[PDB]
Amino acid sequence: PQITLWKRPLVTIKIGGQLKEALLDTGADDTVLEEMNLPGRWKPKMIGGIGGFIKVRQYDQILIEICGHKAIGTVLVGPTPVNIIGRNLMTQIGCTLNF
Amino acid sequence: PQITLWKRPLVTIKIGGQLKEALLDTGADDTVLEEMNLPGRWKPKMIGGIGGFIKVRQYDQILIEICGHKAIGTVLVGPTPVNIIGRNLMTQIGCTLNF
Ligand SMILES: CC(C)CN(C[C@@H](O)[C@H](Cc1ccccc1)NC(=O)O[C@H]1CO[C@H]2OCC[C@H]21)S(=O)(=O)c1ccc(N)cc1
């Protein structure tokens, strides 16, 4: 599909057996989701943006389905105010910017 | 152009007569540029990102060229970690997400 940017590009995702709404975010290197209880190993990470940094948990090789498109890769989890799909997974579903 | 997302979608912009590099950021409602001198009247504003809130100078109706495409809109100036082009200007240049 084609998503215009009049409004926030929020799409439905499926991860860890849950459906959520998340932002298709070309400005995010890596996906970061709001706090959730994922199983498995993780590593601490710090990610920075406007206002400074937050601490997150980095999970590797996590399956996410994004508007019916499957993807598997790094998913960070932490106190983000919004679920963010980053470039690391957007490349896997075929997402480009066009103008 | 069609821009893939295996690298950061950085583009050359022109604002106030000066060339800069900026990030096309579909997760940003607004355009936020690093500290710079800009002609025009401005108002003090606050904007929030992943790490908290920052003070910015809001310049209205600013001419800005993005990768050869002209826009006229709001530009926020402050201590952002990177020059980001938000949806307020990406809509003006006809930018969409496609997969
Ligand atoms: C500033 C960018 C280079 C990086 N950010 C992605 C960006 O899209 C965030 C994503 C975002 C979106 C909402 C809330 C927090 C973060 N947007 C943002 O800060 O936009 C602000 C300017 O316009 C306003 O609209 C939204 C917030 C304001 S980030 O959220 O900090 C980020 C950084 C690293 C990763 N791996 C993932 C996300």
Range of the domain at A52: 1-99
Within 8 A by CB and 6+ apart from A39, the residues are: none
Q: Please judge whether A69 and B99 are an interchain contact, meaning their C-beta atoms are less than 8 angstroms apart.
A: yes
Pairing of strands B32-33, A96-98: unpaired
Give yes or no for a contact between B50 and A47, defined as CB atoms under 8 angstroms apart: yes
Resolution to 1 decimal, in Å? 1.9
Ligand 1 binding pocket includes A27 (Cβ within 6 Å): yes
Q: A90 to chain B, minimum CA–CA distance in Å? A: 7
Burial tier of A27 (Cβ tally within 10 Å: 0-12, 13-18, 19+): buried
Give phi and psi for A67, each to the nearest 5. Answer: 45, 55
Burial class of A86 by CB neighbour count within 10 A (0 to 12, 13 to 18, 19+): buried
Rg, Å, chain A Cα set: 13
Decide if B99 and A49 are in contact by the 8 Å CB cutoff: no
Our count of domains for chain A comes to 1
- Phi, psi (5° rounding) for residue A88? -55, -35
Cα separation, A79 vs B8, whole angstroms = 24
State how far residue A44 is from chain B, nearest Cα, in angstroms: 16
Contacts of B58 (CB under 8 A, 6+ apart): B42, B43, B44, B45, B74, B75, B76, B77
Residue with tokens 């240049």: B93
CATH no. for residue A21? 2.40.70.10
Burial B58-67 (b: 16+ CB within 10 A, else e): bbeebebebb
User: What value, to the nearest 5°, has the Cα angle with vertex B40 and ends B36 and B46?
Assistant: 65
B68 contacts: CB under 8 Å, gap ≥ 6? none
Nearest to B89 by CA among B18, B14, B37, B24: B24
The type of residue at B61 is Q
Of B98, B20, B21, nearest to A99 by C-alpha is B98
Query: What is each CA distance from A19 to A13, A56, A64, B12, B89, in whole angstroms?
Result: 6, 21, 10, 37, 31
Q: DSSP assignment, residue B64?
A: E
Indicate yes or no: CB of A54 within 8 angstroms of CB of B54.
Answer: no
Q: Which atom in ligand 1 lies closest to the alpha carbon of residue B51? A: 31
Name the experimental technique: X-ray
Element (H, E) at B75: strand B69-77
C-beta B52 within 6 A of ligand 1: no
Strands (E), chain A: 2-3, 10-15, 18-24, 31-33, 43-49, 52-66, 69-77, 84-85, 96-98
CA of A50 to the centre of ligand 1 (A): 7
Buried b (16+ CB within 10 A) or exposed e, A2-26: ebebeeebebebebbeeebebbbbb
Contacts of B65 (CB under 8 A, 6+ apart): B13, B14, B15, B71
A23, A24, A29, A50: residue to mutate for ligand 1 pocket, most atoms within 8 A of CB: A50
Catalytic status, residue A25: yes
